[PDB]
Amino acid sequence: LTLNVLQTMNAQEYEDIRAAGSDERRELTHAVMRELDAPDNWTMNGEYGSEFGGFFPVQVRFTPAHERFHLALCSPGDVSQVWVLVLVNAGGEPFAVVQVQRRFASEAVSHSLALAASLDTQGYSVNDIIHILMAEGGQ
Amino acid sequence: LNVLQTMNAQEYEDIRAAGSDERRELTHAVMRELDAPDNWTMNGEYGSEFGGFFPVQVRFTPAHERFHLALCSPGDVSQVWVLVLVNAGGEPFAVVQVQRRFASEAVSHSLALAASLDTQGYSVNDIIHILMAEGGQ
């Protein structure tokens, strides 16, 4: 499971690995995470069962230490044809899709995360962080 | 009911954005149109305890908790209502039904069929394949 393999796989092929089993899915999740860089003092966690809702064959969450909000990277599958990066405030609002990608673009995700982090450190509100990330994300 | 059918994805997100009270009222209005099968519970997301992906998200769960279904509203993530079935452990999983416009009776019917098949001892894999046919997926 190289970066190129992760990029060429369609929505059904993501659902196919989830369908193959828990160990197969876990492998896929780790390969996605291996391509990503979590910002300093943030945690990065993948979903291995349905603890994150189970909606996406791969779901990776990135959370700042204070945990006021998180971002979730959601893979192609039955729900969405494209990779989706969302920002969710605790309590569900504000919320936005800040970026969509047709093909897995790893460096782009990590940069948006790096941007989210520094904006957070710099004391920007969640609303302002969403508005900025959407512009950075072409959204 | 008619307002729910008439609202586009962006109005769903505008209500969640307006505030927690406004979102709660929208969640309850959706839930009021639906019927949970006997011995199942129905719960709506009020914050981000179901992930917060959808302006309205309603979960339907049998008491045995081997699996559940979630109805997910239009918004940023999806232009359409989706009904998904999630097994314990995240697999098997499927979208069993998609709706461009909220069809409350069709959701309740799909849920009653899932409950019916489950009692009759169908595997979750088989319930998925059957509900997808019933749901037009």
Side-chain angles (χ1 to χ4, degrees), chain A residues 41-95:
Chain A
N41 284 58
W42 285 46
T43 62
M44 182 181 60
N45 295 294
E47 174 182 71
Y48 303 118
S50 61
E51 64 274 27
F52 296 163
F55 301 106
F56 313 103
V58 180
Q59 189 183 155
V60 180
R61 290 183 183 185
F62 317 86
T63 314
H66 57 59
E67 300 181 297
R68 290 192 293 259
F69 67 91
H70 70 263
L71 293 93
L73 180 67
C74 313
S75 84
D78 296 347
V79 173
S80 173
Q81 298 303 285
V82 292
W83 285 90
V84 176
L85 183 67
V86 301
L87 194 157
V88 190
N89 204 36
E93 192 281 326
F95 168 92

Side-chain angles (χ1 to χ4, degrees), chain B residues 34-38 40-42 58-62 67-71 83-85 96-97 104-118 127 131 134:
Chain B
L34 300 170
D35 295 316
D38 287 17
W40 285 45
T41 57
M42 179 185 303
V58 185
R59 291 184 181 192
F60 318 86
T61 314
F67 64 91
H68 68 276
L69 287 95
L71 181 69
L83 183 65
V84 307
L85 191 155
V96 295
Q97 192 170 154
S104 62
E105 282 316 301
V107 178
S108 300
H109 274 85
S110 298
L111 296 169
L113 184 49
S116 203
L117 294 159
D118 179 51
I127 293 174
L131 293 180
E134 189 261 358

Side-chain angles (χ1 to χ4, degrees), chain A residues 18-19 49 55 59 91-93 95, chain B residues 16 47-48 52-53 57 90-91 93:
Chain A
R18 133 140 73 188
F55 301 106
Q59 189 183 155
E93 192 281 326
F95 168 92
Chain B
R16 111 140 89 202
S48 64
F53 296 109
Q57 190 189 147
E91 184 280 324
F93 166 89

Side-chain angles (χ1 to χ4, degrees), chain B residues 58-79:
Chain B
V58 185
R59 291 184 181 192
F60 318 86
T61 314
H64 59 63
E65 293 166 354
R66 291 192 313 264
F67 64 91
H68 68 276
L69 287 95
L71 181 69
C72 312
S73 80
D76 289 342
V77 176
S78 177
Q79 292 309 99

